[PDB]
Amino acid sequence: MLQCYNCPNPTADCKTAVNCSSDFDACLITKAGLQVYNKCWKFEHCNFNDVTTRLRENELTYYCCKKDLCNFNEQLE
Amino acid sequence: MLQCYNCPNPTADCKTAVNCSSDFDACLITKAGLQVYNKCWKFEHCNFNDVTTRLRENELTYYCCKKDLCNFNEQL
């Protein structure tokens, strides 16, 4: 399966690694202000609109990828 | 109004600047193998699936943005 950093809640540095279930095909990371999210995610729905609405956030940058444990914080500068 | 580099066909260095009509809200650039595309585009349709099918290309990197003349080659 695909392995992502995945923290139920925003954290300054999530190091909780999970096997995402088959439904999820990508790993997300996104900073919204000082807050940081790390999640199992779907590639189709990795974009400003999908991410902002699904996480209830106004302004963010995001990165998604499909390699194990790729959604680490240094991916966003 | 939005100004993009826009070349009817892939070119190694597109120098054609166009006033995209209001139907387009973004400028695209994408390298697909050795080929390079620069186009007026729609942000909705800026992603691997939409770009590969609309240009008939298998493997590429793309970048889209909305400022005038932003879709230059060094963006990738």
Binding site: F43, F48, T61, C64 | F48, Y63, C64
Partner: peptide, 14 residues
């Protein structure tokens, strides 16, 4: 603010 970059891949966004 609003730009997208990507691959594959690979998605990079504003």
């Amino acid at each position: 603010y609003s730009w997208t970059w990507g691959n594959x891949x690979x998605v990079x966004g504003x």
